[PDB]
Amino acid sequence: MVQSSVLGFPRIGGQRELKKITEAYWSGKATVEELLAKGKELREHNWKLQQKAGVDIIPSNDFSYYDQVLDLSLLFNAIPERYTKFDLAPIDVLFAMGRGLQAAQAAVDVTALEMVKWFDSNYHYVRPTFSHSTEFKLNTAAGIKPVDEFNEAKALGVQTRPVILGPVSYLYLGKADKDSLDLEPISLLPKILPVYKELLQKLKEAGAEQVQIDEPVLVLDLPEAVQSKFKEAYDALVGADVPELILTTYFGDVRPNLKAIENLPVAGFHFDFVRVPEQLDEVASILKDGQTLSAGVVDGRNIWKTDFAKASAVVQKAIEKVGKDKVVVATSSSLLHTPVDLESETKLDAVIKDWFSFATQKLDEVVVIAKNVSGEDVSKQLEANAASIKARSESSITNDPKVQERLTTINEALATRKAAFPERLTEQKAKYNLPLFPTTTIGSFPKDIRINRNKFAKGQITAEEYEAFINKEIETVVRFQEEIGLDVLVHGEPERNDMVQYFGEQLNGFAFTTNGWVQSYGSRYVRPPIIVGDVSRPKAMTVKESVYAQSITSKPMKGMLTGPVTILRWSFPRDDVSGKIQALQLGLALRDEVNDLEGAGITVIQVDEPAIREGLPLRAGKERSDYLNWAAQSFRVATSGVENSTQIHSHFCYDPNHIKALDADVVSIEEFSEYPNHIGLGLFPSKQEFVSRIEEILKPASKFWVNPDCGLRGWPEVKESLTNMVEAAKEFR
Ligand SMILES: CN1c2c(nc(N)[nH]c2=O)NC[C@@H]1CNc1ccc(C(=O)N[C@@H](CCC(=O)O)C(=O)O)cc1
Ligand SMILES: [Zn+2]
Numbered sequence: 001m002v003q004s005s006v007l008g009f010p011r012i013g014g015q016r017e018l019k020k021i022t023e024a025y026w027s028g029k030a031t032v033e034e035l036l037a038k039g040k041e042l043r044e045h046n047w048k049l050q051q052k053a054g055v056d057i058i059p060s061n062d063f064s065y066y067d068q069v070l071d072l073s074l075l076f077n078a079i080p081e082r083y084t085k086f087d088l089a090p091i092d093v094l095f096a097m098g099r100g101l102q103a104a105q106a107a108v109d110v111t112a113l114e115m116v117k118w119f120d121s122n123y124h125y126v127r128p129t130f131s132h133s134t135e136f137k138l139n140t141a142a143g144i145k146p147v148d149e150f151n152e153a154k155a156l157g158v159q160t161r162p163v164i165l166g167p168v169s170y171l172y173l174g175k176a177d178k179d180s181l182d183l184e185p186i187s188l189l190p191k192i193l194p195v196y197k198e199l200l201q202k203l204k205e206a207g208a209e210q211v212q213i214d215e216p217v218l219v220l221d222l223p224e225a226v227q228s229k230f231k232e233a234y235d236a237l238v239g240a241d242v243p244e245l246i247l248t249t250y251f252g253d254v255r256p257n258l259k260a261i262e263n264l265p266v267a268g269f270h271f272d273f274v275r276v277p278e279q280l281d282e283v284a285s286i287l288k289d290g291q292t293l294s295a296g297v298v299d300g301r302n303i304w305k306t307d308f309a310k311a312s313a314v315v316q317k318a319i320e321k322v323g324k325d326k327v328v329v330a331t332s333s334s335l336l337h338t339p340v341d342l343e344s345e346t347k348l349d350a351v352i353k354d355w356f357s358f359a360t361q362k363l364d365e366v367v368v369i370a371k372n373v374s375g376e377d378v379s380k381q382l383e384a385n386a387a388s389i390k391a392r393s394e395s396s397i398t399n400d401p402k403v404q405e406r407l408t409t410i411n412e413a414l415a416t417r418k419a420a421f422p423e424r425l426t427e428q429k430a431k432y433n434l435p436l437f438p439t440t441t442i443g444s445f446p447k448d449i450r451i452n453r454n455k456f457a458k459g460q461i462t463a464e465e466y467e468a469f470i471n472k473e474i475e476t477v478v479r480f481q482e483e484i485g486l487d488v489l490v491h492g493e494p495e496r497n498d499m500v501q502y503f504g505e506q507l508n509g510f511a512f513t514t515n516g517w518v519q520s521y522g523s524r525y526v527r528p529p530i531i532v533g534d535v536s537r538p539k540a541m542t543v544k545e546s547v548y549a550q551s552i553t554s555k556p557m558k559g560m561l562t563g564p565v566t567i568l569r570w571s572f573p574r575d576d577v578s579g580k581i582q583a584l585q586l587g588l589a590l591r592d593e594v595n596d597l598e599g600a601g602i603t604v605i606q607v608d609e610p611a612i613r614e615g616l617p618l619r620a621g622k623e624r625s626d627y628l629n630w631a632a633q634s635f636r637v638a639t640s641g642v643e644n645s646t647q648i649h650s651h652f653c654y655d656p657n658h659i660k661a662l663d664a665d666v667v668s669i670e671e672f673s674e675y676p677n678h679i680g681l682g683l684f685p686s687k688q689e690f691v692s693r694i695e696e697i698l699k700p701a702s703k704f705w706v707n708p709d710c711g712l713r714g715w716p717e718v719k720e721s722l723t724n725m726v727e728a729a730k731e732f733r
Contacts (some may be wrong), residue, residue: 300334
């Protein structure tokens, strides 16, 4: 009988209980005991769910109040001193590191540690931060979270497998603090290993027989000298006095690093065969006698019902290489990255809901697959699964002939402007006559809003009253900008709740959930859109508010759009067609929008792709350069239908060559000399500080726009700043 395994379970709660209790604790409404009681109730509920589903290997220490990497930093005393001088008990040191700390000496405003994207998932972890003076050690009176949680589950009669981030990944994903700029985190390895060993011994003494030790940096391009550290670390940790170690990898391909793990004393490995099924043969063939192979075949980052027949076949290949006794059916990664429970959806059509599985359902999928490859009769589940998979692949939701046919029209001309920039600029100058050092802003501006969204969705106020409120907000914002004297304006987007869902709602091919929440960072969660089929845009999405904003001023009003790659990356994508295809479909839908904007007189249009870098494939090579090419192609498909006098803008927070590939008229960036398309380097503060910072960037005149850093912060600050920025632009004129 082949075992089933889950690498981690989302902890937010089916009703976002974790968010509610933590935010209550932070605002003084709940006590720390109330906090802890809710956490314990969440963990117990999630363990019992997993046991009842029949999962064999059930994780502990996957729970967190904020972030699991932060939890380890607190456990190992990677705590910078500044957080320690306020008499905070350890759980409050933890929160102080995660979210910062303010006290009424002058006031304290101690900033949080940095938030970092966890690989290419949509989760963010708190950066481990080390100094030359870091003394790594266990903190017994803080409680040892993985020991305590292991024991809690055991007392419920649930044997679990503690999960911790391994020492190489933990140090390598961390960074040197300000006061220790030359420190290489990985150099700290000999100092941290004794703390890992101690932790593992305490887990063993409590009854833990296996531990999942995550080494996800093995899917990254690692220097050779980092590669050798795996043999060192794991030779030091393995022994009679510790649990068996299952070295766990996800999100990518470990083959370039196989030599690093081919002679390890660990008890087994886990690999992600959803993202990289093709590494199976080579990773299997380095397993030593006795080592087990955990085959990650149930996607931990997407919401589609698994094809039981294909997932079992992947598992059956593993079984053929190393033996039925040495394979485990697993989720590809932690279920951290999926929503909690499909059964909470109250509005989804049953046809569509038949195609999905969220975390709770994925528990049943790993069990049924495990039974299937072990020889049990599960033909009824197999048949029902095959029926769902079949229905999806034949549905019209998925296949729209017009979109298919439109994809066949994509070619170079469709992704190229009618003329090159220099010629375009001469028509743009005749049209706008913008003065040199033109001034604009990047988008957002500074209460009552949701109040009016609300009575409108319940039909209490007409579309008529709703529109006048929107238009009054737009009005305020436009007049404010005019009185400051900005040259190119924005409307403020009071009509928009969310950069991606605002578009997804208005596009075919999308479905939406009531409860599909995923933790993004801390207590902040996202409810991503789902791409279910071929995307098209039946009609104008933004034209109305932009046309109204443009009508009350003789300054150029920017249209504002989100790009195709960002819409794709902050949605749950289809798993039946490539990312590329989904991006080009989005490019084409956005092209209709850009063209309608231009048609309605909105001939300055900003299109932002803030997710481009998060989507970078994890290793260098063909997949990465293909991604950068199609990403840019998709942007150009959206923006290349316009006349020469229409001005495409794009704004970047974050590689100059990719930016160049977009051929935008104006790029706002928050030493590429021979590049004609114009740039606004972000400046935001004195008029003279402005005067200084521009003067020094001087060291090209006709090419510089002036603008802030990213969206706007209180009215007096924005005003004073914006007004100072404009004054500075005028001197130079
Ligand atoms: C800009 N970001 C973003 C994204 N993904 C999506 N889909 N949308 C986004 O705006 N990924 C990267 C980053 C994530 N940052 C954030 C920041 C705040 C909240 C947030 O405030 N969430 C609210 C719920 C908002 C709502 O009502 O939907 C919360 O309090 O949990 C979420 C993600
Ligand atoms: Zn920005």
